[model samples]
Target: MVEIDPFEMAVKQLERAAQYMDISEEALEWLKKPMRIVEVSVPIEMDDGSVKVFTGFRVQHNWARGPTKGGIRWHPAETLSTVKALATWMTWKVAVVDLPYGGGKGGIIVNPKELSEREQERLARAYIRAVYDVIGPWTDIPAPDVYTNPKIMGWMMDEYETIMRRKGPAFGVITGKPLSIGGSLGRGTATAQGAIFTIREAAKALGIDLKGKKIAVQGYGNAGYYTAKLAKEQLGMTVVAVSDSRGGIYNPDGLDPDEVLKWKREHGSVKDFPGATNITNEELLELEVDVLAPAAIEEVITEKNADNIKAKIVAEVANGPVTPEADDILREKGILQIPDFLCNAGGVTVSYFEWVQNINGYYWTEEEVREKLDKKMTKAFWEVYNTHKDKNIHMRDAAYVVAVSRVYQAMKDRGWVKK
Candidate 1:
């Protein structure tokens, strides 16, 4: 059994796409490495009157298209390689969706749950203060990711604005703001909604009805929880299982997304939810279901567990959730996988809309935002799906075929690569 690292998996995926497209080795080499990566030391005062130094990272993967854009994640399990992999995926995501932005991501190696509200705020501000010189409206924009929210984005944005000595609103400098500030109306659920749109497309093509379809989610974080909500409330799907960092829960009678959400918010885990059997993350992956949404961290469905997945459709809402080896297994099993880049591009799409609104000083209603997002995601899905059928390849390869070709064309047109 080979253990594949997430960053290495990203590179392998890109390399396969490069080969299929016959891209220049020079460009492939350039795309394999990020343009810039910054590591910052974020020092904050703890609630217990002690100073703690936390490490943080920002990886600017590629900016040939435009400024870099991605999110900031605060988790104890964050690593520099994870940031690199995520930033690389961000680049592909932008290209796949034809967005003008590039790719970047930030992560702090700290358990945000352990910090008080004030301490968390201080840590957010301190991170901005440390990386202030490296980030800005035109250079790189950061949004919210795992274990972070709009409030933290607000503090970080304010810190950046203060460093620039300009006020009123540089809201465009950072996305995922609160609506009271400059946040878009539909940004919160954009990723899950976008993923749902793609899944719906797959279901339609495969002649599968979503109503009463069994669903299992491998992460009960924001994306995971919302995926359940959308599948249940919108599609009439049955959410059979969900897992958090601690463990997972299974309810064959179909778990209620809202109740599970409430339980997670109150009890901090889904293990003890009512009328559910506790299971480990590994066990949740093998549950029988129609749709399996991996909304948690990367590499959940590696070669080790790929053979155990019983779901017909694997919709990834997390970055790098499915490994290359697992992707092969899923393809062999005829499990339709909506690749993470195309599936989860919803968040960045809404973030782009939010950026436009901020720049133009005009905001859109939630309905309007969701409508635009659905159109964009649906269009991208059809394109990828069509290519997959026409080329007789896996959906992941088909997505890369579309996205990598676009990126290579851009690089070639700009004379960035020499033949």
Candidate 2:
């Protein structure tokens, strides 16, 4: 079987939802394509005294609602199709969460692990310099994503401010910065926290008590680690298995997320935590559990192995972790899938909060941030859930319906299309 194009997959999702909503053909056409796709060649001098040129992409999928917003990821496998898909999802994610932003995503095809600190800084600044004219506080904002973090974001923001010749800190130009900068209080774990909030709501609707429920998390990165930790501490779920890129560790009784995290930090992988047997990432995915969080990269769950998945709830914390074909199988299996855009939207939702705080030159306590996030996520969850219940459709379809309807209405209200 041929690998599916991620951008095509994204368009298929919109097309599926458009059939349920009354969106115009013109609107559908517009929604299927991005507003702008920018490709730039960033040349930076490496610490080895060699000039390497990296291909970078910045795609703005839509901006009918407001400014475009998304993340900048550094990965060797980065491609335009993947960024397009992520940008498309960011569009729906903001709409589903009811934030006043559209969708955008940026990426560079480079492995950060191979770069020294100085080289990384140069590359970060070069990225901003390359896309400086196209992004800003009022146009498009970029944040940290896979292989990118607060330090990278800080470098990018400073570069943007310097390029723009701004007087003070142009904090709103980027998010996910360190707290000493303009970063939000609860942003480090916002994605996991947001997903956990929705999981809590889903558990209530399913009449499932989360206490002591076995959970398996794939991808022991920032989001995955936090999801495991929070699910245990906040929701009382028992995380029995977690895997990173190398391998995984599992225990039937339970695994302490914090201990595993410490082990991974100390030893560079979660493969050999104390009192746990090593398992492959594939095995971890097929484990029988109440919840399975795919908090890693995309396209892990596909038609090839969708039938083997035994988890009752598959909460997607990563973008595009489930393929459309696999989605069909899982829906047929009656597994409750908390869709990716909705489940992992907490990161962007909190990014919006940080943007607002930066623009207003005021900040909120972590408690305030979490409280407001809970309210927003709870309301958004019910809106999607009620749509699913009423239409008798799968949760992903219901979520797409809810989100696409919102974006379509926004475009219609702006007179972008005729009836």
Candidate 3:
């Protein structure tokens, strides 16, 4: 379980894709680095009448296509390098989804659970103020990520509006807000629904009927839960296993997502579910299922266990769950891998819709959002799928090829790179 540096892995993935295309050295070099990295000192007054200084980062990886777009997170383990890697991924993500934006990511190194409500609000505001000059509707847009939710996004949006001194809402400044504040509908289930759409397309491509086929979900969070639920409801797939960070539960007879969710709510974990077998997270990874969704953490699938994975397809709902080496191994094993950025592109796609709706002072129903999300996900999936087949490269590499080509084209069209 030796951890690989995620940022290094991101670069390695890019370099692997670089070898497949006739990209310029200048374009490749620019793709390897961020355009700007801002480190800010956020000073927040604590609830106990004390002021604490927190470190924050806002990394704008590239903005050649349009305004930078990504999420803001607060975590105890936040670092500049991680944020840089995430921001780089964000750039590729928007490109693959055909969004008119590049990648940007922000994070403050603090544990939100350790702070009081008032202190959290102040910290959110302070971080926004610290990076205020670089972020806006046209400059960059921030949403919610790990340890940060819509409420926190609301606070940041409020701070952004306050700084603008506007009487009405500052449209398109922030996304992932509550519905009352211009958030798009279906964003909550977007990542999962998008993955399902891709999975459907993948099944059609591979000539596999997914009816009643089993899926093992290796994370019980929002994405994982909804993925399992929708797979069973929409695709007639069975959920055989699911895990949280602590452990996992399995049942060959099939486990209902709603029942597991209720059990998790009552028991604090999915372990020891009545009549289900408890297994380690590692065992869940190698489960004999039709689909595997690793939505939990990064680097779960490495070279060490790549040989044991039995799933026909691996849909990555979490970022960087499979290392580059593991990905190569999976490709050799003939497993269809939907790349993380492509698989989870639904969230950002919806975020883009939210930004558009906000700017136009209009909103759409949940059904409309779902329909638009399906179109984007389906098109993006096939774009990468055809590139994979036509180029005879790994799925992950095909994704990178599709994304980097679009982004590099934008760079050339914008005079940032020469033809």
Candidate 4:
């Protein structure tokens, strides 16, 4: 239960990745440091007429590639260091996928579930107004993150447009808005679908057919749920387990994600689904499945439990789910780890597509979006996999190698680094 500093871990990861490439100290420093970090006070009136000021942050990690892009999360456990780490990872994510953008992240240290609907709207809008000066379609675009969804994104986008007094093209400022406004098709499940794409490619490379393979997903949120659904619908994989923050359920006979999700929507939480035994979140990660996806939160699979993980493939749909120590252990165990940034780049890739559509006032069909996402995610997977083979490093480290090399080239191209 010790508090791990995520920013420190990010730096350690950067140093580890740097060993694979011969880069200058200047480039290493540039990779380690963030370009811009902003702190703002978001004050909103409570339902009881009391004004509460919340602390918020927006960190743009690197823009050498292109504009900064990331999500904003409203969580009770939000911290500046966590934001820094996530933003740094976001930079690598877009780069690994060859997106024309940098990395950025925003956070508000408040649990949105604690507020009423009106209070939530006020807080969301207040957050937009407070940080409006720095963010834009081409500057730092914000999207949905943990505990923040399309509704809140819609509110934030509306607030941004209202502040600018021009409602047409401002939709580009936010990516995950509702469809009625500017939300792109296939975005809600982009992260999961994208991860599935990589998983499929990884399976092909490993000579393992996905049909009837078992997967245990540890997070039942947007990414986790869709990951389960798509893995079943598309790949014919057996979703053996699924969990949320509270807990999870297991069925060796393979659970139906669609049915479980429908029941969860009505009964709230997947704990009491019929014909399935309930288990702890930690237990789900150690399940004897073919694929173990830690899609919930960061640092779940530490050194303490990494040895207990029995899955052959760990698809990291969640960011930073494995600590650096656990990463070492998992590597020793011969686990085929699809790093978070590479595994979850679908959301940002689609976000990039959404941005393009928004800027040009044209959107593609869901089929078209999925096709594009598959191409991008598959291409990204091979790049990392090739590095993993050619460099003889761990998959996570290999991912960093591919991502950082691309970003470093961009820095050199822009003449931002010393020769």
Candidate 5:
């Protein structure tokens, strides 16, 4: 089965939004392509006394507003096109939230779990050394993504500083750092927290009370686990099922999100969580829950399974999880899906706040972070939701319209385009 190309889908999605806005053809063409893409070969010395060369990519999708900022993933399936799609999505994400930044993404094509700590450090530093000249606190700031973490980010930051030959504040060069090393307090859980805020608003608008409601979360990483735990603990929703990359577990009697998180953290996956029914990641998405949160990876929900979805609402915590084809089917099924860009914009929203803090050399308390996150997320949610109502369009299209229009306007106003 051939899946839709993510980069192509990103272009199509942006084109649809531009069409809605009646944007100029030049503006649409400019938005359809990335500003710059750099591919490099990172040579590293492994523990086996052998040299390995790995391919890496960095795509700065658009930077008309400010510097580029996004995460770098380490995965065997990492592709230049995937990074391109993510970078494009980041542009819309920043514009949707009205941030003073643009979109960028980078990735290394290797499985981190297959490497030793020393080997991983070499690979991380090598990647930074390869692309160091193009990135900085004022250029493109890198953060943690799938299979990459704060440790990798710290190493990258250190390597960047070493290249510059000055012990300038490394914290400004990267985000998602450890708490002791200038990482923001709420940075870890910002994705899920932000998604939950938008989900809460969607539920309210749909007249659905989340209290005692059933929720199924796919992808039990930091984002998914925190979403499940917070949904249960904070919003009183029951996390009926949750899954990781390995597989999933479901219990209609209601699974304990915190317990599942603990088990997964200790066991390395959510499979076989003590008496729960094991299911594939595919089945987890179609589960009959009040809300289905896809927090794992992209293209999980497509035309094949869109019709199988039984959740009343689908909230995307992962980028590009739902394809455009699947979106139409879900809309036809009357499932109120909160699109990825709008629903998952919370992480980047807080990332922007962290960038501001880094620039000003001051940090906010957790309470302050949460307060600002909520207010900004709430404001962005209503903007899209009301557009959905006023324009009578799909949630995804509505979000794309708002995001693309903003970017187009920025480009036009900056004289980056002409009549």
Candidate 6:
């Protein structure tokens, strides 16, 4: 049981992809490390009238394509390495989807759950103040991740605009803000919706119909909840199990995602739902189903339990949810392990839409946004699927090859490296 360092894992994935492509050692070295790592100390006034200092990080993995884009997560467990890994993933994710943005991610070492509203606001502003010089509309844009939400994004945007002192609206500086500001219509559910499109494509590629197929989701947060709900309403899939951090509940007869979410809202956990057996998160992961979506944090599907996975398709909505070793086992088992950067790319894709709208001051309706998102997701899915078939490789490897090749091309085209 080796400790999983996400940054190391990310580099290993890139290295594996480089093996299949014509990449130079110099290019590999540049891709392995971030171009910029901004660390800041944010001081905030707590509700108790005491000041506390929090460490924050923003890692820009690559900017060869364009300005960097990623999310800001506020979790106590956040580390600089985690930010670097996420930034690296974002770099590939944008390229895989052909978005003209590179990769960057920011985070602060604080648990938002323990903070009061005022304390959270103060902390959000302080973070922007500390990192304001490095980030801008044309530099690095940050959205919401983990414990951060639209309100927090709104606060950060306001702080940035105030510091710059020019504005009718500087909404482009940050995404995932409220609709009153510049948030896209479908941005909230874009991640899950994008994943559903890929899942639809996966089912088609396997010659299986998704109608009434069983789906067991392991994390019932925003992405997981929407994954279940949208799968039921949009694709007619049956959500058999869903879990939060505390635990999970299962009903083979099919759990209604909306009802499960209502129960979780009232009880603070998906456990103890009526007419369903309570199960551990680990148990839910091993449940035999048409699809197993790990929508929580990283490294849940490691080597220890990868052998027990029974899903036909392991759709990863969480970043680094499956370890490199687990990926090997799953690939050997013939499971269609959709990589995180590709499977869960909908959120950032919509974030890109929101940024475009803000920059151009033109917005789309929810229907229009969803239509465009489906088109983008579907195209990317088949592209990777075809690459997998053509190259005789796993889906994750195919995706990395597609993305890393694109990034390599961008670096060369920019004359950053010799052709």
Which model is ahead, 1 or 2, in terms of TM-score?
Answer: 2
CA-lDDT, candidates in order: 0.83, 0.86, 0.85, 0.84, 0.82, 0.84
Residue 214 accuracy (lDDT) in model 4: 86
**Per-residue alpha-carbon lDDT of candidate 6 for residues 1-419, written as tens digits (9 for 90 to 100):** 86978688778877788887778898888888899998999999988888999999989889998888988888888888888888888888999899999999988898777888888889989998999888888888888877877878889888888898975447899888999977789777888898898888888888788875788888777777889888988888888887777887888899877777788779878778998998888878888899888888878877678798888998888876776677877787778767888888888788889988999888889899888998888888888888888888877778888898888898999899994
Which is better, 3 or 4, measured by TM-score? 3
- In model 3, where do residues sit more than 4 Å from their true spots? 1-5, 167-169
> For residues 140-159, what per-residue lDDT tens digits would candidate 4 score against the true structure?
89988778778888888878
Candidate number with greatest lDDT: 2
Q: Which residue ranges in model 5 land beyond 4 Å of their true spot?
A: 1-4, 48-50, 167-169, 245-247, 265-286
Better of 2 and 6 by lDDT: 2
Clashing pairs in 5: none
**lDDT (10s digit) by residue, model 3, range 97-168:** 888999989888888888988888888888888888898888988888888878888888888888889854
- Model 1, range 1-419, lDDT digits (tens) per residue? 76847687678777777655667777778888998889988899988888999999989987888888988988888887888988888887888888888889999999977888999889988998888777777788898877887878889878877788885448899998898888788777887888888888889988898876788888777777788888877877888888878988898898878767877778767767789888898888888899888878877777667687788988877866776766876787887888878888888899899898988898888888888887788888888887888878888778888887777787888889867
The residue-by-residue lDDT of candidate 2 on 261-341, one tens digit each, is: 778779878766789898898877888899888988888987788899898888977876887777887787878878887
Say which candidate scores most in TM-score.
3
- State candidate 4's TM-score: 0.93
Q: Give the TM-score of each candidate.
A: 0.89, 0.93, 0.96, 0.93, 0.91, 0.94
Q: lDDT tens digits, residues 232-346, model 5?
A: 7778788788777688888887778767767876986877788689898777766788988887787877666768888888887786688777688778778787887888788
What lDDT is obtained when candidate 6 is compared to the true structure?
0.84
RMSD of each: 2.9, 2.1, 1.9, 2.3, 2.5, 2.1
Model 1 lDDT, residue 198, Cα: 86
For model 4, the run of ten residues with the poorest summed lDDT: 325-334
- Model 6 poorest ten-residue lDDT run: 166-175
Write down the RMSD of candidate 6 (Cα, Å).
2.1
